[PDB]
Structures are given as structure tokens and as C-alpha cells.
Design a protein around this ligand. Structure first.
Ligand SMILES: CC(/C=C/C=C(C)/C=C/C=C(C)/C=C/[C@H](CCC(C)(C)O)C(C)(C)O)=C\C=C\C=C(C)\C=C\C=C(C)\C=C\C=C(C)\C=C\[C@H](CCC(C)(C)O)C(C)(C)O
Ligand SMILES: CC(/C=C/C=C(C)/C=C/C=C(C)/C=C/[C@H](CCC(C)(C)O)C(C)(C)O)=C\C=C\C=C(C)\C=C\C=C(C)\C=C\C=C(C)\C=C\[C@H](CCC(C)(C)O)C(C)(C)O
Ligand SMILES: *C/C=C(C)/C=C/C=C(C)/C=C/C1=C(C)CCCC1(C)C
Ligand SMILES: *C/C=C(C)/C=C/C=C(C)/C=C/C1=C(C)CCCC1(C)C
Ligand SMILES: *C/C=C(C)/C=C/C=C(C)/C=C/C1=C(C)CCCC1(C)C
Lengths: 259, 259, 260
């Protein structure tokens, strides 16, 4: 029933929500331009592979935020019986509607942006193909099951079941980052930079499942405008500054990553 | 206008349909646990690539059956004039509605699980990249056109044309299995086990298009409760037992697949 | 609401629109058969990789056109305020329905077919993995942001912003084709054939955003039936004849691209 235009207007009209989305369209767009400029001097192909994979992070991100701000990837869903937010209402302009604002566009595009973060990080750490494959596949599985959790309205139980399965996929990714690649990085001569990015990645990434559980999709203690800003803040660090730091290093150590 | 909740409880109250789904959520989960412990000894990166791709099959499966059981990946569609299922009703409770229950969730996830089965088999057979690429791309095409056949409600003829395209992609896959990898496995010293898994695969996979044609998607001589169980049986073999036989071999012959 | 059968019948009974779709289901089918027959003699794995990547182009295409003709991948969307097609009607079924017939199924399958055109071209040119990865990812982004633009009905400005993002991705692909692979083909020993296919591809691909801009999705100077024939005509060249020309070279020069 709810129109895309109505969701687009819902975002606008709500300063918190609007700012969380439009600021990242601008920041993601500025990042891409800055990163392209920063790596214009690279010559080595492997270094260039790391740079492109990294640049695709804000490319996917600017598209993701446009999808959310435009209302294309947002829906109003009614939570199942027992859910902390069942019976909630949203109100579009002058009409009130049952349900909560489900910004599934975030969970959907993470399946594209997070694999690129992992690919760049893995290559930076000199990972073999087997570990890259494992990290990336389970990362995608994590994102898609999380998406499924948000989209499930039939049962409150099923929603948290999806969430658990997603967490299990998340532990695999964490294992490879904290255990496997931390070791490979030393052998690749990138331990230093990897430690900084590994710590950043693990701490920031742990924040998403927390925000999800506290927002309307979970226990509903945080308003939609708050949960959104929390994700955008995480994105600013997990994506943009994370990419700046990686590329700043790459442009200064092109030779070490070459092989 | 049917709700996810209505589809969820529809699965309930229907013993055959419900059991065929929840039973595989458990069996797939149990498979994952068993496989992880069976492969804890592997150290060779190539041996571990084969193990992870094999483990991903039941990982895609728990999510797929959860999507089905939850009602997330099921819909009620009205079949086109001339279709044997056209004119049928379902009634999601007390208000009966026209159409048939379409478990497209199965066709959708196959595009993710079957490529992993093929990846494991190809690697085991010592396949080169060209053949792996060919098998996987045509397998995905097979699954996606099968999903399209099921979601097409406009024309009975179109539904079957889609089915034909899917069959042509399937022949490509069957060809690489029976002709190409069967030869490659000899060079890899895995002809023995490949011949076993190859036989199991071809025989089980061939059953899927038969079930489709017999069920509500085709001539509708079989009720969904039966078609769902047929697929579930096929999955138990084509996926879980297949995974066990491959992994049990791998753990006893890691030196063979290494390199 | 608007049913799949209604769109299917809409396509039928509309000579222009119907022909633009059914003609290509046929041409893509015949292309696949012809290409399979043409490449029968290939034995080198790298030569065969190029052939299979090329053949997948019409495979994805036949599936695409079936999705459009069946109505599966078509929808009626109402354009936002200020859009030159806002307030349009399509007359669907036995009633008049507001909006425009959006054949989004084209944009969706391009994300699968165009990367294959690029994979075959890049290999022909002896491209390293970095440039292939770059060409394919940005090409997929171009297609997906194009699909998003056509699917956006909330804001006229958002539609064109998506379009711009898509164009930016297109320039990346164009740069790799015209600058990078043009030079790599010289080392690969496929300078002449790559240059020919490079030019044909660049000229035809430039046609798509022009058609989008002129069609109902854009400034709406071209009705849906005409916008559809424009795309179908472009596909016949950029996909089917392009593939025929590439395979024609491949099967007479297998040794040149054999490498590894
Ligand atoms: C939408 C938007 C901006 C879009 C900008 C784009 C798409 C530019 C992409 C540039 C690339 C990918 C450059 C490639 C180089 C490598 C070149 C290569 C490997 C191909 O030789 C390198 C060193 C990584 O900068 C703004 C708002
Ligand atoms: C819908 C339709 C026709 C569909 C036809 C199909 C799906 C046939 C595909 C055949 C292939 C891909 C054969 C592989 C060969 C290579 C073999 C290999 C690499 C596997 O050894 C080669 C040289 C490329 O023809 C018609 C109307
Ligand atoms: C640019 C976005 C990033 C780096 C996103 C990261 C997202 C995650 C680590 C999400 C994890 C989740 C779970 C572990 C449980 C279920 C729900 C999710 C999807 C929020
Ligand atoms: C885990 C699932 C497996 C191994 C599924 C295999 C499925 C197939 C071989 C399906 C084939 C089909 C056709 C050849 C024609 C059209 C309908 C399908 C999708 C049932
Ligand atoms: C078989 C299809 C082919 C070769 C399609 C090519 C399509 C393009 C080059 C599309 C480009 C577009 C833009 C640059 C802007 C936004 C709209 C598009 C998708 C038409």
C-alpha cells in the first residue's frame, strides 16, 4: 500500500533520518573521488587490484544510500505476535500506517560491499585463495540471512533463528580475520597496517548486530532515526576511513604489496 | 494479498508439507556439525577449499528450508488457462483464495547450492578453470530459468518453454560430469571416488525435473505435500549423503587432492 | 492489480512491441545453435574459455527476452512529478491504468550478459586479472544502477542521479576498452581483431543510454514500443553479430589465443 514516494518523503521531513542518509551519499561520493585521486599513481597490478576492490566499497555504498534515500529499498512491515514492536505505527505525511520502517536496503547491499572489504583486507594480508573464499562466502551468507531475518514477519521465533544463523556465519569471518590473516600479514610484511585495519574492522563490524538487535527490527528500544545514524556512523568508519587508511598505506607501500 | 503469517501456518496443519521442511532444517544443521568435526584435521589449502565448498551445500540448505518453513520464500500464484493446476484454490485459513502454493524458495536457493556441489566435484576431478566456469554458469542458468518457469503465470506455453531452456543448460552440466570430469579424475588420481559421487549426482539431479513436471508446477498429479517430500528425499542424498561420502574420502586421502 | 497475463496480452496485440521481443527470442536461439556448431573444433582451454563466455551472451539474452515477452519482467510504474511521462496511461486489460510500461527485465539481465561480452573481449586482448575484475565489477554496477533508475518512482531527480552514477561506471568500462585493452592486445597478438570488436562494442553500447534518455524512462520522446525496438536492434548488433564476428576470428586463429 505504501508508495516509494511516501517513504522518500518519510526520510525527508525527519532531520535525523534524512541526515543519516544524505550525508553518506555525499561522503561516499567524495570518498570515491578522493580515492581515485589518491591512487592515480599506482603502477603495480596487484596493488591496483587491492585499490579497485577498496574503491568499490564506497561505490556500492553510494548506491546503497541512494536506494534508501529514494525509498526504493525501504518497506513498512508488520512485526509478528510477541515482537517488541508489534502494533507500532509509522504515519506517512497525513496518514498513519501499521508496522515499522524496514530499511532492508542496508542488509541487501552489505552482501556486495562487505565482500569487497574482505577481499582488499585479505589480499593486503597475503591470504591464499582458500581463506579468501571461506571469508567471502560466509560473509555473504551472513548478510543474506540477516536480510531474511529483517524480512520475516510470520514468526518472532523465526526472525531470531535467522539472526542466530547469521551470527554463526559471522564467527567464521571473525575467526579468519583475528586468527588466520593476522598470521599471514606477518609473512606478507603487512602486519602493521593489518593490525590497525583488523582491529578497526572487528570492533566496528560487531556494532551492526548490536544496532540491529536494539532497533525496531530487534527489541525496539531505539527509534528508526537513531538506528539509522548508528549504522551510518559505523559505515563512516568501517567503510570510508577504513578505505582511506588502507589506500593511504597502499600508495606508500606499493612495492611491499606487489610481491 | 496473502500474508507471510498465513503461509507459515498453512505449512502447519499439513503434516506432509511441514515435516518435509523442518526435518531438513535439522538434518542440514546436523550435517554441518558433523562435517566441521570430520574436517578439523585437514591442513592442505587445496584440500580445505574442497571441504569448505562441500560444507557450504548444507549451509545453503538450512537457510533454504528455513525460508520455506517460515513462509518467506513461498507464494500463492494463479496458474494460466489450460494449466492442470489452473482453477485450484488453497484457503489460508477460513477465507479461501484462488491459486496454488508455489515453493519457489527451492528453485531460488538451488542457484547457490548446486554451484558449490559442482565446485567440489570439479576440484576433486582436477578440472581446469574453463570446465569449472562452464559447468557453474550453465548450472546457474538452469536454476534461474527453472525459477522463472515457476513464477510465470501468464501463459502455459511460456512456462514449458522456460522448462525446455533449463533442460538444455542441464545437458551441458551432465555432459561435463559424465564425459569431461570423468576423464580428468583419472589424471587427478580420484577416478574411484569421483565415479561414485558422479553416479549419485547424475541420478539424483535427474529426479528434480521429473518431480517438477509431476507436481503442481507441471501436470499436477502430485500434491505439494508429496512433491515437497520427494525434493527433500532428493536433497538428503544429492546434498547430505553426497557431502559425507566426499568429505569422508577427503579426510582419508588429503595427499591425493593436495597440490 | 496489474497481472502478468495482462502484460503478456498487452505485448501481444501490439505488433511493434511484440515483434521487438519475439524476434530476439528467435535470433538468440539461432545464434546459440550457430555458435555451438562453429566452435566444435576448439581444443585449447583458453580458446574454449573465450568461446563459452561468448556463447553465454545469447544464452542470457534468450532468457531475458522470454522474461519480457512472458510479462514476468515487465511492470507498470507511475513516473514522479516533473517527469515528461507523468500522468501517462497504458490501457491495460479492460481498463485504463496510469503509469508507463517499464521493461526492467532488460536492465536486470544486462548485468549477466554484458560482463560476458567483457570477459571474452578482455581475454582476447590478453588482459591481466586486475583489469578484467575492474571492467566486470563496474559494468555490473552500471547495469544495476541503471535498473535502479528505471525502478525509482519517488523522485524525478533521483532517477537522473542514478543515471549519472551509472554513466560514471560506464566511463570506467570505456576507458579500459579504449585505453588499456587496446594496448594489451598489441602484446597479445590480437591487435586488429580486438580493435574492430572494441570499436563495434563502444559505438553500440553508447546507444543504450541515448535510448534510455529518449525513451519513456527518460524525456519520453519515444513511446515504449519504439524504445523497445531501439534496444532490440542494438542487441542484435552488440550481442549476436558481435559474438558471430568474435567467434569467426577465434575459430580461424585458435593458436594465437591458445596461451594458458
Ligand atoms: C559516482 C561518483 C564517482 C564515480 C567514479 C568512478 C566510477 C571512477 C573510477 C575510477 C577507477 C576504477 C580508476 C582506476 C585506477 C586503476 C585502473 C585499471 C586497473 C583499470 O588500469 C585506480 C588506480 C584504482 O585509481 C561520484 C559521486
Ligand atoms: C536454448 C537453445 C540452446 C541451448 C544450447 C545449449 C545450452 C548448448 C550448449 C553447449 C555448450 C556450452 C557446449 C560446449 C563446447 C565446449 C565444451 C567444454 C568446455 C565443457 O569442454 C563449445 C566449444 C563452447 O561449443 C536453443 C533454442
Ligand atoms: C558497510 C557495512 C558493513 C561493514 C556491515 C557489516 C555488517 C555485519 C557485520 C552484520 C552482521 C549481522 C549479524 C551478525 C546478525 C544478524 C543481523 C546482521 C545482518 C545485522
Ligand atoms: C540441492 C539441490 C539440487 C542438487 C537440485 C538440483 C536441481 C535440478 C537438476 C533441477 C532441474 C530442473 C530442470 C532441468 C528443468 C526445469 C525445472 C528444474 C528447475 C526442476
Ligand atoms: C546486451 C546488452 C548490452 C550490450 C547493453 C549495454 C547497456 C549499456 C551500455 C547501458 C548503459 C546505461 C547508462 C550508461 C546510464 C543509465 C542507463 C543505461 C543502463 C541504459
Amino acid at each position: 500500500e505504501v508508495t516509494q514516494r511516501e517513504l522518500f518523503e518519510f526520510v525527508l521531513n525527519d532531520p535525523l533520518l534524512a541526515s543519516s542518509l544524505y550525508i553518506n551519499i555525499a561522503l561516499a561520493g567524495l570518498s570515491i573521488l578522493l580515492f581515485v585521486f589518491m591512487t592515480r599513481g599506482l603502477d603495480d597490478p596487484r596493488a591496483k587490484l587491492i585499490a579497485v576492490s577498496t574503491i568499490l566499497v564506497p561505490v556500492v555504498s553510494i548506491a546503497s544510500y541512494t536506494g534508501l534515500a529514494s525509498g526504493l529499498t525501504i518497506s513498512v512491515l508488520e512485526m509478528p505476535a510477541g515482537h517488541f514492536a508489534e502494533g507500532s505505527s509509522v504515519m506517512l505525511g497525513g496518514e498513519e500506517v501499521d508496522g515499522v520502517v524496514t530499511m532492508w536496503g542496508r542488509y541487501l547491499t552489505w552482501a556486495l560491499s562487505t565482500p569487497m572489504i574482505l577481499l582488499a583486507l585479505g589480499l593486503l594480508a597475503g591470504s591464499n585463495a582458500t581463506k579468501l573464499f571461506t571469508a567471502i562466502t560466509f560473509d555473504i551468507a551472513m548478510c543474506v540471512t540477516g536480510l531474511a531475518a529483517a524480512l520475516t514477519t510470520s514468526s518472532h521465533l523465526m526472525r531470531w533463528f535467522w539472526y542466530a544463523i547469521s551470527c554463526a556465519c559471522f564467527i567464521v569471518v571473525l575467526y579468519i580475520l583475528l586468527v588466520e590473516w593476522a598470521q599471514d600479514a606477518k609473512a606478507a610484511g603487512t602486519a602493521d597496517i593489518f593490525s590497525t585495519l583488523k582491529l578497526l574492522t572487528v570492533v566496528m563490524w560487531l556494532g551492526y548486530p548490536i544496532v540491529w538487535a536494539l532497533g525496531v527490527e530487534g527489541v525496539a528500544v531505539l527509534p528508526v532515526g537513531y538506528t539509522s545514524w548508528a549504522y551510518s556512523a559505523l559505515d563512516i568508519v568501517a567503510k570510508y576511513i577504513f578505505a582511506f587508511l588502507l589506500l593511504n598505506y597502499l600508495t606508500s607501500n606499493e612495492g611491499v604489496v606487489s610481491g
